[PDB]
């Protein structure tokens, strides 16, 4: 019996099919000062 198509990994690799979650974005420190009256 011949190998099923399901087990054949011979044809060229295509683009990676999933993504790695990126590192959290870096944020800037936010300083507040009241607006003057």
């Amino acid at each position: 019996a011949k190998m099923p198509r399901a087990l054949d990994f011979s044809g060229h690799t295509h683009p990676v099919a999933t993504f790695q979650p990126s590192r959290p974005e870096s944020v800037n420190d936010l300083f507040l000062c009241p607006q003057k009256e």
Binding site: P4, R5, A6, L7, P21
Partner: protein, 460 residues
Amino acid sequence: GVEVIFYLSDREPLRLGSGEYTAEELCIRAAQACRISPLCHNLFALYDENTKLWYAPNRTITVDDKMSLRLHYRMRFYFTNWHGTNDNEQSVWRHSPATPLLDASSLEYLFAQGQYDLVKCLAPIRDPKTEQDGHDIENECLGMAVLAISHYAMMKKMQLPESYKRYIPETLNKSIRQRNLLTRMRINNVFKDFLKEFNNKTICDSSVSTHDLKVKYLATLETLTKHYGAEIFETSMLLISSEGNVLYYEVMVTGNLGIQWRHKPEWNNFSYFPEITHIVIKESVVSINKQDNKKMELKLSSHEEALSFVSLVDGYFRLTADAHHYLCTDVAPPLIVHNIQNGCHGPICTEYAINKLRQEGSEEGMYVLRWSCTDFDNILMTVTCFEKQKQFKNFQIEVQKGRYSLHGSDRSFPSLGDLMSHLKKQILRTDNISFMLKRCCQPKPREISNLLVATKKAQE
């Protein structure tokens, strides 16, 4: 009690205390539990395998100590050839400033689900064209059992421990157990041959990762089973503007092809998602209205089935036409609604926020609000600033039980808009730059971002 079940083996269900929940709130918990990124979150919904019905994101679940309920957290929205390995077919990617649709945890989750589908016959194998094809399908099933087993072993860091029976559809197992002894021994042996040939020869010879194994399996379900990724709805009354025994139709919805229909016995196209303007529900009746004033009306079993149908069309509309908008008030996701009321984007990449500021937020203080790409608890505010020479700064906003606070602050607000008004009375600073907030650059209808999937039919 009331539980949200996972298809992943190593994962404990969610056990819900008494109280009030949204489907969406539960799906958010579920994604945190399974490491599903905010970006992939809206591919998933809650499914009741007994009633055969999906919950709309805004459905309310009141849990008491009496009620017993099992929901499965399940990937719902699906695009054939997301994996890009069938070269006969359109590939399907996110837009980019093209990325993959799925994150690694979503792929892992989908693999567990797909295995469950195959074995429990939720994904039924296709029918033989001939006795020759019949045997051929059966061999592909054995291969699938080899993928499943090989992957389970590569995960536990095993090699040749010490059958196919639990990794193939149960109907087919039943079928095999009723054949003569020599038949059953032949099958087992071909399976043992495939398995040995794969793990010795094929894996090393092609450097096959657990990732390739997951991809291969799911790509194979697409061609091995019937209408993988489709939902088919049955109706007595189907009225279409363009066109005795009680006549019967099927309506099929898929990510790639949209809304198709036929006499229950091939498929006629009614509409792709972006051509839809709005959808109305009248008890069990659903009308889908297109831009060209054409309409499909259909009558389903119940209102709950109507809500399940419309959730699906609406979820695919968000995925292919407009990430920030909804077609039907009755299934509108609460986060979608609140985001609209607040001028807030979904988890767009930073570059899209910058591009929107470079076009419509050129002055200092113009901002974009966007949900974080990496967790469900934070909104980012991206602001145009200038030195003393244009820069873009990002500031984190915490969201915790309906309360909004700047990152680190002991002061919180009962709504995002309250927090913004307060902030609009301050002088803001970071690094050397001081400025005051000007106006929000809100999401625009039908704009393109990484929240949208670029399928063949979505291009128009």
